[PDB]
Amino acid sequence: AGVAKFAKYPLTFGPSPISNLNRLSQHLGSKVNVYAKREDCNSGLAFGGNTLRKLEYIVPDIVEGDYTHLVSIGGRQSNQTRMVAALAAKLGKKCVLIQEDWVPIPEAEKDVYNRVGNIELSRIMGADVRVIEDGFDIGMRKSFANALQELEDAGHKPYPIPAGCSEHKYGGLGFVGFADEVINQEVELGIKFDKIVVCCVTGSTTAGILAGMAQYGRQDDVIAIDASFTSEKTKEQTLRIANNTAKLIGVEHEFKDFTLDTRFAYPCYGVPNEGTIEAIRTCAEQEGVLTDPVYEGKSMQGLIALIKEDYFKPGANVLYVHLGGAPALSAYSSFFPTKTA
Amino acid sequence: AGVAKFAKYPLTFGPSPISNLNRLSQHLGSKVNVYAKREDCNSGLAFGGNTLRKLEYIVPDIVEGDYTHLVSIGGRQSNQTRMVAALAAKLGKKCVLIQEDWVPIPEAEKDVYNRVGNIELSRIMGADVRVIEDGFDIGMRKSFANALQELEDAGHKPYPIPAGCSEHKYGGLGFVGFADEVINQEVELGIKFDKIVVCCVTGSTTAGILAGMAQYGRQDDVIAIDASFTSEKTKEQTLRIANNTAKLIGVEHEFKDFTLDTRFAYPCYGVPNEGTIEAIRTCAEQEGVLTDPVYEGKSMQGLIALIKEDYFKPGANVLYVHLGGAPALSAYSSFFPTKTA
Ligand SMILES: Cc1ncc(COP(=O)(O)O)c(CNC2(C(=O)O)CC2)c1O
Ligand SMILES: Cc1ncc(COP(=O)(O)O)c(CNC2(C(=O)O)CC2)c1O
CB-hemisphere CA count at 13 Å for A341? Predict the structure, then answer.
């Protein structure tokens, strides 16, 4: 036990708040009491989001070192790239982003998809944004390394930050701290969360939550709603991270498997489905809380699905984990026509 | 000055946090110490913003009586209409929003300005978005009353929420509370702010801050940066709201004038000048903080210009007020091309 033995650099206002989505509760049958951990209300750094939690434990190394460039990677509307740019700015360092094509840009958006959303924000923050177009892979890419070798030859000291930080040694520490927070908040709010619903694609977030909740023997409370539509590698990598992070923080527990629903990943990574959009509309319509079509949207549809199929015990307190990602909504304006009548 | 005398309804996480933009301060020649009270990180209701703070003192009057629909008005990319849509989605009411044509939509943003950004979000929250052609104006609009009659003719009980909640009778109370928070936060920071810089269009925000700071005789610390490009009315309406709010709370002092730097509104409301774009970029590149081309980008360029001309005492602590607006940044992507390295 102990994430405390690792250096942390503050990038958020502190413990992310928890929302009481009581109105969305009744709309779903008053079967459960839905709540939301707002990681999308993280800090003042370009809208916040889950990646900021992860970066807090990575920054120390960046600063202690003497790097001069923060190089990350993702797909078009990648949320991480936007927050890494925000970090480089705050650290007074250069930034090189790689926006590959991981989502089949729905024709009805082939225009704004590359000019708006999160990619616009990275440019405004002055990062060297490079629009590449390679396949989707929640793993190491054969371009991210090139950029690295590139800046090195130029005479710079580049700092690597893989997709989702999932393959960074400390990629899972941030959400371990997330668990510590929830436990403390349950006591302040006086509300015990029976389950934790969170989206998953590259790992680190879920894994950190697993290894962290395990500190209290509550790994099982976790319910990871897939969104990568590749349960294969996705569930394996998350597990590889869950075990490693566990070792770092001292938890002996061994993760062999975890609840990873996969009925809402379709039709593909980045592309929603009638259900996804319906979840966003419902959540937005009921709680005034916005969710995107890529991550938080699907994980929200799954949440509403489970509440339907009386999956949770009657009167259970479920903690929905809003990891952010709403700034990409603009690259999906076509999926949301105006209310009928 | 008893503002607590008025009923308040929770819409934010509590007192907005204050960021220490020490990097930007250094970047600008270490002339002053810049801070930023984050109204843009005040709630989980669709990104949040200044309107929400205003609304907290208006919601009580709503739910109290029997109103079916909430109706507001603003430009195509209004932030208030987007937040009202959330407040509506939350208070479990109907929402009809009038989006007037307050901005000469740049040719490069014509096929986006009305489908992306804030207008989009307001639609996801199931608001009845009505796009009207009427032009810019911070005063009571015809289309407004027309809809108030329309609905009231169809057999409903709409609640009138004018632009910026400025014309509303309780529109100023919100930021009178801001002032309160400021004085308290000065106590917890162990410092005192010499000046407060904030954008100003419809007037309710500044008027609130003015009437509020007056409770402590510090109204002169306020520096409003205009973004309307219509000095007279904005100054006159702000001055009007400030005096009414002054009575409500209990402040005797009457405002006959206030500091309104009109140097940066150019070329007009809703359109940025090269200085605005430069400011947005400088803040983003220095702090990772996002400002918009319509409101905060201009108040920020005003802040920067004032610091250059040594307007503040050396080592002065200046509190910049971030009122949000960044969500609309998606309708102005043409203005921020990828920087070069
Ligand atoms: C809102 C939101 N929800 C979930 C996730 C996924 O996190 P995990 O990879 O830790 O499962 C992201 C990530 N973002 C990436 C990006 O490019 O933005 C893939 C890294 C997210 O932004
Ligand atoms: C980011 C931002 N900054 C300043 C203002 C103006 O404040 P005042 O008019 O209350 O001084 C708005 C308002 N909004 C309106 C809208 O239609 O959104 C005009 C009401 C704002 O959104």
Answer: 0
Q: For residue B265, what is the DSSP state?
A: S
In the beta sheet, which residues pair with residue B255? none
Work out the minimum CA distance from A147 to partner chain B, whole angstroms: 14
Residues of chain B with CATH 3.40.50.1100: 1-45+168-341, 66-167
- Tracing tokens 């809380």 back to the chain, one arrives at A289
Resolution in A: 2.2
Asked if residue B302 lies in contact with residue B261, where contact means CB atoms within 8 angstroms, the answer is yes
- Which residues on neighbouring strands pair with residue A37, listed in sequence order? A18, A321
* Architecture per CATH, B66-167: 3-Layer(aba) Sandwich (3.40)
Token pair for B76: 């195509």
Q: Which amino acid is at B171?
A: G
Looking at chain A, list the stretches that DSSP marks H as alpha helix, in order from N- to C-terminal side: 22-27, 50-55, 59-64, 79-91, 117-124, 144-153, 173-189, 204-213, 231-248, 274-287, 296-308
**Omega prior to A10 cis, within 30 of 0:** no
A328 vs B contacts (CB less than 8 Å): none
Distance CA A93, CA B286 (A): 10
> How far apart, in Å, are the Cα atoms of B341 and each of A212, B212, B276, B277?
40, 46, 22, 18
Q: Give A290 to chain B, closest Cα distance, Å.
A: 6
CATH of domain B1-45+168-341: 3.40.50.1100
Contacts of B126 in chain A (CB under 8 A): 281, 284-285, 339
